Amino acid sequence: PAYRILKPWWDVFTDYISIVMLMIAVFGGTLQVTQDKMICLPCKWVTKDSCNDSTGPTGIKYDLDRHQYNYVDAVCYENRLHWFAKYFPYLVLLHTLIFLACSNFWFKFPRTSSKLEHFVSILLKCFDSPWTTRALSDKKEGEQAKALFEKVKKFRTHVEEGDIVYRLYMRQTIIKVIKFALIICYTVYYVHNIKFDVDCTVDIESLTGYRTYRCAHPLATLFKILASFYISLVIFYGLICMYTLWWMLRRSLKKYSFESIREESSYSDIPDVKNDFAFMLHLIDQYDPLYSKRFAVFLSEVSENKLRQLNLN
Amino acid sequence: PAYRILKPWWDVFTDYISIVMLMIAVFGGTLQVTQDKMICLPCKWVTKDSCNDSTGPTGIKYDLDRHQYNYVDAVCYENRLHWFAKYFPYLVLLHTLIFLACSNFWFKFPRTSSKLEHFVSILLKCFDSPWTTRALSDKKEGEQAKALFEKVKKFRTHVEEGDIVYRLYMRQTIIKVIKFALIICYTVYYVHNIKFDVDCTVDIESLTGYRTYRCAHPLATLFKILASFYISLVIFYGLICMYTLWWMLRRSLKKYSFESIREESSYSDIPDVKNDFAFMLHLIDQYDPLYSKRFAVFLSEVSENKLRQLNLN
Amino acid sequence: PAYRILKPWWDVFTDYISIVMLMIAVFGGTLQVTQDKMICLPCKWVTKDSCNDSTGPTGIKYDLDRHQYNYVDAVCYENRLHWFAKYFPYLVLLHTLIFLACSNFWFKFPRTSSKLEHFVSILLKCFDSPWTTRALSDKKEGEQAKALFEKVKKFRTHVEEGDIVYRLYMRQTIIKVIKFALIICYTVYYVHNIKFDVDCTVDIESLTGYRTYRCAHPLATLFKILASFYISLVIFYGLICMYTLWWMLRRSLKKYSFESIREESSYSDIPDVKNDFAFMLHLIDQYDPLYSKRFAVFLSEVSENKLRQLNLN
Amino acid sequence: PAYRILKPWWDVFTDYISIVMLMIAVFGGTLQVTQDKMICLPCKWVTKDSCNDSTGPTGIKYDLDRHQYNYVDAVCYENRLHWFAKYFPYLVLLHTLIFLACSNFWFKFPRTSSKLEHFVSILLKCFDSPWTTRALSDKKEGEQAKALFEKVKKFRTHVEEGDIVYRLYMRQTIIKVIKFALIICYTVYYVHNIKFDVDCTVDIESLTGYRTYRCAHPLATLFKILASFYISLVIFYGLICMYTLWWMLRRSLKKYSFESIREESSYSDIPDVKNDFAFMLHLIDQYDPLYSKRFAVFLSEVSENKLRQLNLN
Amino acid sequence: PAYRILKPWWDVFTDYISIVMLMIAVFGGTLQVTQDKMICLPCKWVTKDSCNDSTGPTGIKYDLDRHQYNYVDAVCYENRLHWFAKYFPYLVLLHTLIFLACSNFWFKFPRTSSKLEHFVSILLKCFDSPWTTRALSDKKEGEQAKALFEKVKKFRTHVEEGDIVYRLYMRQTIIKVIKFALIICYTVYYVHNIKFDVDCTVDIESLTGYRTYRCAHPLATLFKILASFYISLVIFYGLICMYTLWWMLRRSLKKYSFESIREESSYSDIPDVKNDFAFMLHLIDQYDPLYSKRFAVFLSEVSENKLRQLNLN
Amino acid sequence: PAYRILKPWWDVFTDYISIVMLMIAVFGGTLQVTQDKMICLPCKWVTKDSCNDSTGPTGIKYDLDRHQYNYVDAVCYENRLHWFAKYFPYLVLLHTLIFLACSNFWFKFPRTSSKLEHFVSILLKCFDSPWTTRALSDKKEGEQAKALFEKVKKFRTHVEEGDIVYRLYMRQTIIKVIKFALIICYTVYYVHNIKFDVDCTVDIESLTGYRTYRCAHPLATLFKILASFYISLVIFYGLICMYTLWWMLRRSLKKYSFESIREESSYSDIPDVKNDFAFMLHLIDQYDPLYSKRFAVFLSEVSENKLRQLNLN
Ligand SMILES: CCCC[C@@]1(C2CCCC2)Cc2cc(OCCCCCCC(=O)O)c(Cl)c(Cl)c2C1=O
């Protein structure tokens, strides 16, 4: 629904890179389903499995009908063609689905989804209160504010015991970084293996007569373009993931230094949050600090004290 | 709607695995209806009903036009090819539909659908009531709270007599486990029977002249890849099903023990729910214990006393 | 809308069986319009207008180019092939459409659709009314309660004189049963006429030279698979329809015995319903008896009294 | 908008017949675009521009390569095939579009759309008022009641001068019947020009060498099936239209006799609507008579007097 | 939204005609992408750039394989085929997109979209206020009415100074008329230059061996049908546009004649709107005069004085 | 949502040009993947690696089968065909995606998205309140009037510090202008390369026997048409971007003088906005100046004082 408030800028660029990855994966997949044939001809003069390259010119007659051209095309396409040419779109579709599942497992797991839903509910109610204006700058509104005070205190006593959300959000980015590393380790190593002019030697003499054939796989340049684009796009994804991993392993997100807002607002009775709530408060501060600024007045003892004083008067 | 509360975490992994099942099923189906052909050539020298493997090289002339090549391709495609190589996408699509119907029959059945809707409505209303904050730690909401109290008192007697929800959720998982057992029983046995080389001896000499042929089914490798992926993914599905069946036969879900709320909430008078409401309370406890914690205040005669002296005074 | 209460489980299983029959119909139709060809070859030796079946092997030369292969393919495909092999997907799509029309004509015909929507509206309002709590356990709410009383009395005086809903729901299921009988009557008789090998004798000697041909129909096995699947699915559909017809002609749904509820609710002055209102009373009791549970108090004259002296006092 | 209440039952069957017409039109269209081929062979021996039909058998060699077979297929497909075979899907699609435009121009025209919207709004407000039950069987309800009375007296004077809706819905049905007459006049006359066997005598000897050819249009049987289905289905359409035309020129919908409501409601003072409002009230009665019955209270002068008495006391 | 108020009847027929123009455009486009080929044969005997046209008959042998028929087909398709046969669907797609852009630039331009949105909002608020029923024929209603009065006066002071909507609607309709003139000027001139048979002479003897050719373009009849249909449809479009241009240049739409409603409402104090607002009131009068009747009381000085008297008393 | 008010007219024309660009890009892409063919023929009598062009006419025989023709087509399609003839649709799709990203990045970045949405929300709320018209021409209305005064003061204190929105929306246009310069710089330089006639000398005699081939790219004319259309569309896009860049560097949008509204309304105690607030207020003044004028009252301290006087009274 309105879960955009728990997404930083590095989780949106990820969400669009993982969309264009799906785009190129589907495009390569449908193109490989559509054509992906390889045209093969036999060499007459051959030495050490290499073609010898030895009035008016006339055509060379091989004396083959079409159907055993199709057979040798299928055989040399299956056997002597490197597998990375054949199944590259089906690899990258799997990789981008694993990336999407790893990105959205944090939302879809219920043990943290409930906590996130309750958190966004109480922050929406805290943001849509009128009495924070008086707290920062009638009896029914005061008791309504007291009800918000009690439910915010209940949330604070509830969620500050666990570590599951922070642990899950650590374990998502660490395996994203590992997957990026593995992708870069094999894909650029095998990307040279696709090319156009390819030989084959498939040992079928009893069916055609020739021993060695020279083939021409014609989608190779386009597949090379798509693979290079995929390499650059995965590089960008990995730089984003490495940056956010460094940020989260350096900035010590477990506790929130809340004193800076309270010093200027002169509300000294608001302490630091212990764990698993200060992390989400950091993450919404990464959206904007105004939401965390409006949350001080719903956890300050002087603020409940003026609330009950106004209710008594 | 708001039925996502009733679905545990293992019912979401299942619901996404059963989606990618249908994805690979429709992919195999569209590939098979698009091409699924096979190219056959005859062997001139026959030994043991096989191919004997017996100045420049020249082609071998069979003296066959294209159309009887098409005929022998069709005959060797039907008579000498295993049925698992042809109808595997339709088979896995059928099994995917069986799993989906098994998972949603417990919802669309009306006798349990009515009880589930009633249960989720009273949990939403009890979760939205503000009297829980006063009970754990104006008057007109007191009498509507009394109305909710009477509604819960009616519902508790109304659903105590049943067992249908627990029976259906037992039966659905046990037949899902049986379906897993059969699927892994036959698929891994028959998966070896698809291969790129197939020899056919279809006994048509009056139409072509040759007796034995030698073919090349070009999609065998891709179908083997899809089948192995399907087997591993079914293995994940069945591991989840065996885990949830073990949990059901282990934790004794028929009755509920309620003292873990009452001991720390200081409400000495609370009952223990008997059956078919205890199971649903377990099902929402798997989501979170907070909903069961806020449901305790609507079940105590001392809370009835608090409301009665509250709205009298 | 919210007419889904009026559908029992036997009218939801039917609704998915219709969907899956439409799915197999459109799949067979798109496959048949895609290829559905038939490869044909002539036989060089003829006995009883059929193929006689009479150093190394060599091919047989027929001396026919491609175009007069295609001509004889078309001629043998039209003149000497059973019509059930060609128009089976169109036939089953037509049957699925007429089953859907027989399902939804009851809901789209206005002279009963108006009665159904009025009925479901007043049952929703009567079930959601707050006076049922005190009925089963102020003053202006009493005025809306007696407005509900008067509109229920108006509905009872109006719709009881009809018979059209019961008449239509007779005449829909009975013709569904007749159509099942017809489908099972012809389909299992004509299903054995599809096969892979077919011999056409078409008497075209001035265009090719040969007289009798032999043909292969590669789609025969898959069409037989789909046909057997459709036969089994129709048998299950007709079992559902015969069960609901047996129940409906057994229990004699014209009048309701309302005496069961007043035995425990101690409201002896609640009468029986004559006709064409007890029908949907049964039809909503099949959903759940709670809606008829919370409807007795809105038609009884002692409840009229209880509201009347409540407003008086 | 809310125009579903304005459509009688004879415009419900029409709206689905017009959908199945469009679906068979688009099926024929995709057929005729996708393949719609013709296969042609020459006759060596001719007798008055007709084929004379004159050890082992051998083929007949025509000495024609494939591309001048394609040429003679093109020329014999255009010059010697009837136009009803080629453009029948486009004809039926055009007629379906004209039927839809004819049946919805009555709604899309603004000069009557405004009147229909105002009419359905005031009947919704007449149906929503609780004062009707009080009139048939405390002061603010009288205020909105008298507002509704005054706006009904405004509407009745506003819409009584026109004659536009009745005239347009004359013209709609009468041109629908006329188009029925034309369709059945020409389609069953031209349906016999589609046939599997077609003979062309084009006399292009300078490019092939032969004079006459004997062709085979392969989709003729399926096109004949579709055409016969279309004829029967548009016959059903025309019988529906003729029935509603006869109904509308029999029942004399210009004026509304309205005695049947006042005789059972005891309201001796009510008038008869003159024109152009009587027809629409007949139409909503044809939906159901309840809305026409409930409209008597907002026009009777004694009802106005009772409302004025309740507003004064 | 509900912006159908601001579109007259001549701007809805225009919209539907634009939709069917785009439909035939995309149909012709996908047809021309899918096949659009042409079959060409050489003429063995030539006289003045034309074919000389000179036991049993035998075929003519050209000794040309299929691929150099494909070459001559491509060459004679590019050079000696008229371009209007080639790019007519793309031309008509461009024309219908230009027509849609011209029809919606008036709405999407914000400098007029603001005025249209404010005008339609004010007219709807004037329609929905219940004080109009009192005005044409207790203090909160008067305050709401006087707030509406002052905002109507401020809106009148606002929009009377500009003149941009009328001028943009001028510049819209006049370019629509000029574009129609251009389309009809060139399309009927070039429509005669598509035909089935066409003679090409491309001077390639070093590759094929012949000089001139005879060709056949199989889509010519369908393209001519679509072109004639488009010309008739564009004629209808231009008749509609010239009619509305004549009406709008004849009625002098800048200033309103508001006397004919004040003389029957007996509100003698009402001013005539000068420009750019009276044109909008003319446009709403083209929908219905009821909105003009209800808008009279929200500008009358005696209506303001009656409201002041009601507020004071 | 409500961001359409806050987008000038030069971001709607751009937003439609950048969907026409995507439409022609996807059309070119699907055409190129569908056909991707070019027909090549060998030249016998050659000079300087070019085709020298050195009873009745007869065809020229090359003694080549079809599969060698396919091979030489593939080779001359890869090597001697320019890359701009092949990857132009993918290039223009990439440029379209870059333009769309530069269009929507200023929305999707959260650090400015928060400011933009908060600004548009408070503008909508200030436009919604009726007290503005009273100020520019019941104490509870003053209470939320003072609440909106306070939160507008908080907004003015908050957003006026930074410059990020102005910096981003300047950077986006300057890089769009740079991208325009690059595209126009290279596309018109490379557009001359595509043509129907292309020669190739690929040095493969061991496989065919010939050395030079003359070819024909049958889609070069349509690709040239699409390229010229794209160049014109790019030119119009760049003119729009040059206009908005000149507008930015000419109006000096950093501060906003507020003199006109205070001069016409005699509210002399109004301030001048410093930065990052004047920019967005300019950008909605481009929509209409009335939204800026209705915000004048809420910044006015004499309006604050007169509200204080009304609250005192
Ligand atoms: C007039 C003399 C005929 C002799 C010929 C030789 C070929 C080897 C032995 C003789 C030439 C030829 C061309 C054909 O079309 C071109 C090759 C296949 C493309 C079909 C398109 C598709 O892929 O659908 C076909 Cl089909 C045949 Cl059968 C034959 C022959 O028979």
Residue numbers in the entry:
A (entry chain C), B (entry chain D), C (entry chain E), D (entry chain F), E (entry chain A), F (entry chain B): 15 to 68, 92 to 174, 233 to 408
Paper quotes:
SWELL1 or LRRC8a (leucine-rich repeat-containing protein 8a) encodes a transmembrane protein first described in 2003 as the site of a balanced translocation in an immunodeficient child with agammaglobulinemia and absent B-cells. So, for about a decade, SWELL1 was considered a membrane protein that regulates PI3K-AKT mediated lymphocyte function, and it was not until 2014 that SWELL1/LRRC8a was discovered to also form an essential component of the volume-regulated anion channel (VRAC), forming hetero-hexamers with LRRC8b-e22,23. We previously showed SWELL1 to mediate insulin-PI3K-AKT signaling in adipocytes, skeletal muscle, and endothelium via non-conductive signaling mechanisms. Also, we and others showed SWELL1-LRRC8 channel activity (conductive signaling) in the pancreatic β-cell is required for normal insulin secretion.
As anticipated, SN-403, SN-406, and SN-407 had increased ICl,SWELL inhibitory activity compared to SN-401, with SN-406 and SN-407 having IC50 of 3.1 and 1.6 μM, respectively, and SN-401 IC50 = 3.9 μM. Overexpressing a SWELL1 mutant in WT HEK cells wherein the endogenous SWELL1 R103 is replaced with an electronegative E103 (R103E-SWELL1) functioned as a partial dominant negative for ICl,SWELL current, reducing ICl,SWELL 84%. This residual current in R103E-SWELL1 expressing cells is less sensitive to both SN-401 and SN-407 inhibition, as demonstrated by a rightward shift in the IC50 of SN-401 from 3.9 to 6.0 μM, and SN-407 from 1.6 to 4.2 μM. In initial maps using sixfold symmetry, SN-407 density was less apparent than for DCPIB/SN-40131, potentially due to a reduction in SN-407 occupancy that is a consequence of lower compound solubility or the presence of multiple drug poses in different particles. Pose 1 shows the drug oriented vertically in the channel’s selectivity filter in a manner that is similar to that observed for DCPIB/SN-401, but with the lengthened carboxylate chain coiling to maintain its interaction with R103. In Pose-2, SN-407 is tilted off the SWELL1 central axis, positioning its cyclopentyl group closer to the hydrophobic cleft between SWELL1 subunits. These data confirm lengthening the carboxylate chain in SN-407 preserves electrostatic interactions with R103 and enables additional contacts between the carboxylate chain and upper hydrophobic moieties in distinct binding poses, consistent with the results of our docking simulations. However, collectively, these molecular docking, cryo-EM, and functional experiments indicate that SN-401 and SWELL1-active congeners (SN-403/406/407) bind to SWELL1-LRRC8 hexamers at both R103 (via carboxylate end) and at the interface between adjacent LRRC8 monomers (via hydrophobic end), to potentially stabilize the closed state of the channel, and thereby inhibit ICl,SWELL activity. Indeed, SN-401/SN-407 cryo-EM data and molecular docking simulations likely reflect the closed state of the SWELL1 homomer.
